[PDB]
Scaffold this active site. Sequence first.
Site, PDB file in Angstrom:
ATOM      1  N   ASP A   1     -22.653  -1.817 -23.932  1.00  0.00           N
ATOM      2  CA  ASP A   1     -22.196  -3.093 -24.477  1.00  0.00           C
ATOM      3  C   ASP A   1     -22.938  -3.434 -25.768  1.00  0.00           C
ATOM      4  OD1 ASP A   1     -21.668  -6.060 -24.775  1.00  0.00           O
ATOM      5  OD2 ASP A   1     -20.681  -5.735 -22.843  1.00  0.00           O
TER       6      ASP A   1
ATOM      7  N   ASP B   1     -16.297  -3.064 -28.112  1.00  0.00           N
ATOM      8  CA  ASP B   1     -17.742  -2.922 -27.991  1.00  0.00           C
ATOM      9  C   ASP B   1     -18.200  -2.536 -26.585  1.00  0.00           C
ATOM     10  OD1 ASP B   1     -17.439  -5.413 -26.623  1.00  0.00           O
ATOM     11  OD2 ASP B   1     -19.482  -5.965 -27.201  1.00  0.00           O
ATOM     12  N   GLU B   2     -17.262  -2.122 -25.739  1.00  0.00           N
ATOM     13  CA  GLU B   2     -17.597  -1.764 -24.364  1.00  0.00           C
ATOM     14  C   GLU B   2     -16.951  -0.462 -23.910  1.00  0.00           C
ATOM     15  OE1 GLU B   2     -17.223  -4.770 -21.431  1.00  0.00           O
ATOM     16  OE2 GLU B   2     -17.868  -6.397 -22.758  1.00  0.00           O
TER      17      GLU B   2
HETATM   18  C1  LIG Z   1     -16.262 -13.319 -24.777  1.00  0.00           C
HETATM   19  C2  LIG Z   1     -15.494 -13.223 -26.070  1.00  0.00           C
HETATM   20  C3  LIG Z   1     -15.735 -12.190 -26.964  1.00  0.00           C
HETATM   21  N1  LIG Z   1     -15.033 -12.128 -28.101  1.00  0.00           N
HETATM   22  C4  LIG Z   1     -15.286 -11.047 -29.054  1.00  0.00           C
HETATM   23  C5  LIG Z   1     -16.515 -11.410 -29.874  1.00  0.00           C
HETATM   24  C6  LIG Z   1     -17.566 -10.389 -29.487  1.00  0.00           C
HETATM   25  O1  LIG Z   1     -18.265  -9.942 -30.651  1.00  0.00           O
HETATM   26  C7  LIG Z   1     -16.798  -9.257 -28.823  1.00  0.00           C
HETATM   27  C8  LIG Z   1     -17.551  -8.681 -27.633  1.00  0.00           C
HETATM   28  O2  LIG Z   1     -17.604  -9.693 -26.633  1.00  0.00           O
HETATM   29  P1  LIG Z   1     -18.835  -9.765 -25.606  1.00  0.00           P
HETATM   30  O3  LIG Z   1     -19.464  -8.412 -25.372  1.00  0.00           O
HETATM   31  O4  LIG Z   1     -18.388 -10.369 -24.296  1.00  0.00           O
HETATM   32  N2  LIG Z   1     -19.807 -10.798 -26.370  1.00  0.00           N
HETATM   33  P2  LIG Z   1     -21.024 -10.322 -27.312  1.00  0.00           P
HETATM   34  O5  LIG Z   1     -21.172  -8.822 -27.389  1.00  0.00           O
HETATM   35  O6  LIG Z   1     -20.843 -10.888 -28.701  1.00  0.00           O
HETATM   36  O7  LIG Z   1     -22.268 -11.023 -26.572  1.00  0.00           O
HETATM   37  P3  LIG Z   1     -23.426 -10.149 -25.876  1.00  0.00           P
HETATM   38  O8  LIG Z   1     -24.422  -9.708 -26.920  1.00  0.00           O
HETATM   39  O9  LIG Z   1     -22.826  -8.941 -25.195  1.00  0.00           O
HETATM   40  O10 LIG Z   1     -24.127 -11.003 -24.847  1.00  0.00           O
HETATM   41  O11 LIG Z   1     -15.575  -9.831 -28.359  1.00  0.00           O
HETATM   42  C9  LIG Z   1     -14.062 -13.105 -28.410  1.00  0.00           C
HETATM   43  O12 LIG Z   1     -13.429 -13.017 -29.484  1.00  0.00           O
HETATM   44  N3  LIG Z   1     -13.801 -14.115 -27.569  1.00  0.00           N
HETATM   45  C10 LIG Z   1     -14.464 -14.230 -26.415  1.00  0.00           C
HETATM   46  O13 LIG Z   1     -14.218 -15.176 -25.636  1.00  0.00           O
HETATM   47 MG   LIG Z   2     -21.004  -7.216 -26.178  1.00  0.00          MG
HETATM   48 MG   LIG Z   3     -19.526  -7.577 -22.927  1.00  0.00          MG
END
Ligand SMILES: Cc1cn([C@H]2C[C@H](O)[C@@H](COP(=O)(O)NP(=O)(O)OP(=O)(O)O)O2)c(=O)[nH]c1=O
Ligand SMILES: [Mg+2]
Ligand SMILES: [Mg+2]
EC number: 2.7.7.7
Length: 342
Positions: free
Chosen positions: A9, A104-105
């Site tokens: 992630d 990103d996953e």
């Molecule tokens: C949860 C979410 C994510 N996204 C997009 C933005 C993030 O850059 C991308 C990956 O989401 P995520 O892995 O759930 N969030 P993150 O990677 O930015 O936070 P973290 O570092 O993993 O905690 O997806 C949205 O556009 N709307 C959303 O509600």
């Molecule tokens: Mg992420």
């Molecule tokens: Mg995630």
Amino acid sequence: GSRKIIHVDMDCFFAAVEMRDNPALRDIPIAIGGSRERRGVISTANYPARKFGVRSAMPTGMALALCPHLTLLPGRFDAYKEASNHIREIFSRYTSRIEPLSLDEAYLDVTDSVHCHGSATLIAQEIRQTIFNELQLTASAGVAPVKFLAKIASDMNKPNGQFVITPAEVPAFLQTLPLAKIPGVGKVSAAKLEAMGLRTCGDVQACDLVMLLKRFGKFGRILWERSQGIDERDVNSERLRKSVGVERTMAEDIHHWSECEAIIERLYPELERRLAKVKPDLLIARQGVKLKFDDFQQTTQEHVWPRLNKADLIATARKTWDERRGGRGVRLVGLHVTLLDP
DNA sequence: TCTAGGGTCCTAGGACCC
DNA sequence: CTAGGGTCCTAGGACCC
Ligand SMILES: Cc1cn([C@H]2C[C@H](O)[C@@H](COP(=O)(O)NP(=O)(O)OP(=O)(O)O)O2)c(=O)[nH]c1=O
Ligand SMILES: [Mg+2]
Ligand SMILES: [Mg+2]
């Protein structure tokens, strides 16, 4: 048998890219999302912003009242797609068993791998290091016998960390594991369980499977199984798109039909050149429209249709507008297709 | 605070098909 | 001696990213 699964992630994906391409940020509260002007929502925020409580899916107006100095970014999607493709190539360096869940996953089945002496830990570590070097992006990882535990462990050491759950650590880990930590268990489900006196997986282990099947159906079975640490879900790697749609939210008004139709006329060219990319002949099992009203309630109208065509979408949207609008204003107009099976 | 734009899967009420 | 079972539509909920 016992698999070695890895969930990868990206940390603060969008904001991480934007900060990487602009070090003037990095130490300031930034977020990617739409303006309150155009009724936006936060896609994601960086850590300084999260310190103020800025979350994903938070209304930008709500985020600005929490962080008055939040810098708001629109979003550079292609810059995210390049990174996604890159990290997926990095994943392919280690195995073919790859199930991307987003940009990103990804889940990786890395059992039969002979890469780091059969160690999922060193493999995940090397994937994170390689990603760091080749992209200047940071990443976190979960290592587990099954999928959902890899997902859970993936968030336990973020940012830029990894967590490993071994088969011997699983039972102790499951006991005090909140059900809301399980993927697929959101607010409603967790509140239902909570109301039933169930908070942890350990609470579910001492439960009647029949009851769970009654009150939740398949969800109950899955809940019980993963509460037991069972997740027979195999990393697929053959997964394909099952739909594509183009929708938009306005500042609003649209109480007239001509506005809805105009917006459809501006939405169709893109539903075309997005569908054309993954089927040049414009496949389609169903076609449809979506309308969202001022009460935030929404409706969808789809039908069996053999091929993408604007006229039918306009007609259907006319019927949806005529029959389901109920005099309500429309905040959003959307187009949607469903694709075919292989 | 005033709530995106994408998608996934699941369920279910009713319409068909046999 | 009016058909229930099963599959398909189709609208919507929950959820994830
Ligand atoms: C949860 C979410 C994510 N996204 C997009 C933005 C993030 O850059 C991308 C990956 O989401 P995520 O892995 O759930 N969030 P993150 O990677 O930015 O936070 P973290 O570092 O993993 O905690 O997806 C949205 O556009 N709307 C959303 O509600
Ligand atoms: Mg992420
Ligand atoms: Mg995630």
